[PDB]
Amino acid sequence: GMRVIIAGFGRFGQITGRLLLSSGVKMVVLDHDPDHIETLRKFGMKVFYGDATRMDLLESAGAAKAEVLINAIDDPQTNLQLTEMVKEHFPHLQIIARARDVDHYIRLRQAGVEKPERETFEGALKTGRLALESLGLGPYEARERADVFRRFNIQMVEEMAMVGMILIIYAHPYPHHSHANKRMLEQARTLEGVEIRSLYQLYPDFNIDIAAEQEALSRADLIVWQHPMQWYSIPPLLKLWIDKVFSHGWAYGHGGTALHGKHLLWAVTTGGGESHFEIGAHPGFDVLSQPLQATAIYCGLNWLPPFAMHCTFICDDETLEGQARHYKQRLLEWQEAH
Amino acid sequence: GMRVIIAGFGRFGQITGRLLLSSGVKMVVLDHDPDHIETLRKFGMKVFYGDATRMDLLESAGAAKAEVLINAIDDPQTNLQLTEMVKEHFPHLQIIARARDVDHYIRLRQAGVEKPERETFEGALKTGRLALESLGLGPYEARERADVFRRFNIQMVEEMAMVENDTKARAAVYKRTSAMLSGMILIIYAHPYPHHSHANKRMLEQARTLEGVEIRSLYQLYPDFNIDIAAEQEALSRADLIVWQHPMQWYSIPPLLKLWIDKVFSHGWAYGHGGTALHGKHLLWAVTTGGGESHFEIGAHPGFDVLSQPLQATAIYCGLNWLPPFAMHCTFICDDETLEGQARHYKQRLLEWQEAH
Ligand SMILES: Cc1cc2nc3c(=O)[nH]c(=O)nc-3n(C[C@H](O)[C@H](O)[C@H](O)COP(=O)(O)O)c2cc1C
Ligand SMILES: Cc1cc2nc3c(=O)[nH]c(=O)nc-3n(C[C@H](O)[C@H](O)[C@H](O)COP(=O)(O)O)c2cc1C
Ligand SMILES: Nc1ncnc2c1ncn2[C@@H]1O[C@H](COP(=O)(O)O)[C@@H](O)[C@H]1O
Ligand SMILES: Nc1ncnc2c1ncn2[C@@H]1O[C@H](COP(=O)(O)O)[C@@H](O)[C@H]1O
Ligand SMILES: N[C@@H](CCC(=O)N[C@@H](CS)C(=O)NCC(=O)O)C(=O)O
Ligand SMILES: [Zn+2]
Ligand SMILES: [Zn+2]
């Protein structure tokens, strides 16, 4: 109220709330514990007293208009009650819900909540990482092990609840803020046989699913690395995706022939024109492709001449559109030639 | 037993224990809940059934020999009781502890637990992120906002763990923190697996024998890719030579070093109007490669020296004085003589630089 209602403002709701408050989000918060209300007021937090399962209190908190309801109620039965009421009466109100445990998670999934958050799960993973670190594992390797286990465990719990092809690897860190690439992708979508995988949408925590990515690469004939140039090179997540996905025994080495015969296009946008690259011992835009070409060739790919969209610092929306067209044109040309 | 004791095998201790089983960690469990017996039997887990706070149970569990005790007990008083008993009787036993909330976190910090993990804290942040995404924020930008929130939140709770339990004091800290949220050599070391390194590890050992060297191991400091820009910029402010040291990966640099560049070389600090913080400083690329020079005969622009271009261009743009790279080649097929000698040469490069400045 205006945009978010938070039901329950104990330890869980408080942290969700304060994160949202930091971002300027306007909210209305309900909690049924009078002592919790007191302490929150001591810290200058505005919180309303009542049972969030009461329809009258939800309506006066603005449920008919709100965009998101955070269900931070601890008790499974009440938490589920709230979720079922909201689903029934407020069909546009997106519910993001805490789950006490796996049984509660399954129930919430079945009520139609997309990604219920088991309240101790991420804390218990962190504690596991700390135990690994104390036993002498490097923190990064320990984080990676926790990532593998999380992916495995979510798959398991999800199963319990149930019970001329072009692949564009897009790596813009801020897709919603893009002008040049966003337009390029709009134009590329109008083609047939184009899949787009936006790495920063898929893997905001830098935990690549190698098996998923290798499957998508299997189905592709042209692979495209599309991104804004950053510091004469590529974004961090794309470098991570290469390091992980182009794996020993798959992309290279004995038996690693998965990419043989496929083609790779570098599609990059820059803030300067060709003039900006006349610096250092090996000047010129084309020299910057070397590490990417070498990667591609090592793994048995065919490197295509890059598509380079120059001058974005000093460019208009007209020319941003002309270059988006040249991009679609490049891709179409590839497809017809194939 | 052999190395780890987990006290409590509820929702929390079960996840932590299951993660360690995937790492082949030897563990024994202290639990007193009849409903967990079958779960523990199914994993083949040795269990000492009873109150974990009992000295006789702890000794039977091997506490005098264990490296780590994971205190996953839910009840804050019982969890503190076990913490205190262990600190008193088993001086070498490292305690990793669950915390119920901020008051409990503070009490564990005061009992000498280094990094108590507030049980719902990371799950609530994830929830906060899913909300932000549902309001239209991109998942990556939403994660970054959670990282900034976390950094400040931990700072605030650490400040509170030094004041007294008194609410008005704690309240002041929160208000102050909430407002806030609304020839020296510096080696930036970026091996993803420092403990597994042979060549870089030896290079660092040698560099450590010089005077005025500081090493920041990025993958130790930031395993979650959440760089603290202010801490990095402070350390750069003190350095005269900056070294980027790492194993080469796919003809280029590791992801976390690229993130460090993208984040730390900020507009108005490293470049742009007023961005002169790096002017006068020097940069050395110090890189190890598996292949020899012959390995870089690939692509339209062959040869190792070409691969420095994006890095040299980055330096020049930020007003750094680029030095000739240090490159140790042939790690795949080099001996331990060649690998100790190359590391000595690294030390010689740094020393020679110190002599000229
Ligand atoms: C961290 C950072 C580093 C950048 N480095 C370069 C650079 O090396 N060369 C260049 O021409 N532009 C550089 N830029 C500009 C981007 O390439 C440009 O803003 C982008 O291509 C615009 O595309 P978009 O509208 O899709 O965001 C950089 C931008 C940022 C954020
Ligand atoms: C993901 C990955 C990519 C690599 N790419 C290259 C390569 O581009 N060229 C090369 O000569 N060595 C490459 N290597 C080999 C490493 O550079 C080499 O093993 C490392 O420098 C050894 O140093 P260390 O003993 O400190 O680990 C790569 C290694 C990994 C894991
Ligand atoms: N029906 C309800 N309406 C509003 N708040 C609730 C309800 N049931 C539980 N709560 C609150 O949910 C919060 C849960 O605490 P915690 O487990 O610390 O997040 C407490 O502050 C409770 O008062
Ligand atoms: N004194 C104790 N000794 C051993 N285990 C305990 C003790 N007190 C609580 N626990 C366990 O801690 C776990 C906490 O449950 P949960 O919140 O689900 O992680 C349960 O398995 C309890 O049996
Ligand atoms: N005594 C409580 C909760 C007390 C509480 O809500 N504490 C706040 C600080 S006033 C908290 O820990 N919020 C979560 C956090 O800040 O990490 C309980 O154990 O259920
Ligand atoms: Zn975005
Ligand atoms: Zn390591």
Contact B19/A128 with Cβ under 8 angstroms?
A: yes
| Helix boundaries (H) for A227-279 | 236-245
Positive or negative: CA dihedral A247, A252, A258, A259: positive
Does B92 belong to an annotated binding site? no
CATH of domain A165-338: 3.40.50.360
Q: Which two tokens stand for residue B77?
A: 């008083």
Task: Read off the tokens for B126.
Answer: 């994830």
Rounded CA separation B243/B193 (Å): 18
The answer for A300, left when phi > 0, alpha when psi is -120 to 50, beta otherwise, is left
State whether the Cα torsion B175-B178-B180-B186 is positive or negative.
positive
Tokens encoding A63: 């449920």
Query: Exposed, middle or buried by CB within 10 Å (0-12, 13-18, 19+), for A316?
Result: exposed
Cα A32 to ligand 3 centroid, rounded to whole Å = 6
Q: Is residue A294 in contact with ligand 2, taking CB distance under 6 Å?
A: no
Closest CB from A139, A242, A281 relative to B250: A242
- Asked if residue B296 lies in contact with residue B224, where contact means CB atoms within 8 angstroms, the answer is no
List B residues 251-270 in contact with A (Cβ-Cβ < 8 A).
251-256, 258-259, 261-262, 265
Centre a 10 Å sphere on the Cβ of residue B92 and count the other Cβ atoms it contains: 9
Q: φ, ψ for residue B209 (rounded to 5)?
A: -80, -10
Determine the distance in angstroms separating the CA of B176 from the nearest CA of chain A, rounded to an integer. 11
**Quick one: fold of B1-163?**
Rossmann fold (3.40.50)
3-state secondary structure of A283: coil
For residue A23, give both structure tokens: 């971002």
Alpha-carbon gap, residue B96 to B117, rounded angstroms: 8
From chain A, the residues in CB contact with B160 under 8 A are: none
> How big, in percent rounded to 5, are the helix, strand and coil portions of chain A?
50, 15, 35
Pairing of strands A27-31, B94-99: unpaired
In units of Å, what resolution does this entry have? 1.8
Straight-line distance from the first to the last Cα atom of chain B, in angstroms, rounded to the nearest whole number: 54
CB A224 within 8 A of CB A166: yes
d(CA B173, CA A88): 43
Domains A1-163 and A165-338 share a fold: yes
Domain ranges in chain A? 1-163, 165-338
Q: Is A170 exposed, middle or buried, given 0-12, 13-18 or 19+ CB atoms closer than 10 A?
A: buried
Distance CA B270, CA B349 (A): 26
Nearest-CA neighbor of A108 among A124, A96, A119, A120? A96
Q: Which CATH superfamily is domain B178-357 in?
A: Flavodoxin domain (3.40.50.360)
Name the residue in chain B with its Cα closest to that of A94. B134
CA-nearest of B6, B2, B30, B26 to B16 is B6
Contact B26, B2 (CB under 8 A): yes
For residues B98 and A128, is the Cβ–Cβ distance under 8 A? Answer: no
Residue of B nearest to A98 (CA): B127
Q: In whole angstroms, what is the distance from residue B212 CA to residue B338 CA?
A: 27
Q: Which atom of ligand 5 is nearest to the CA of A12?
A: 14
SS3 assignment, position B99: strand
Closest to A12 measured CA to CA, from A83, A73, A90: A73
CA A50 to ligand 3 center in whole angstroms: 10
* A92 at interface of B, judged by CB pairs closer than 8 A: no
Q: How far apart are CA B333 and CA B289, in angstroms?
A: 11
The residues with which B294 forms a beta bridge, in sequence order, are: none
Distance A265 CA to ligand 1 centre (A): 19
The neighbour count for residue A72, using CB atoms within 10 Å, is 30
Nearest C-alpha neighbor of B14 from the set A160, B38, B79:
B38
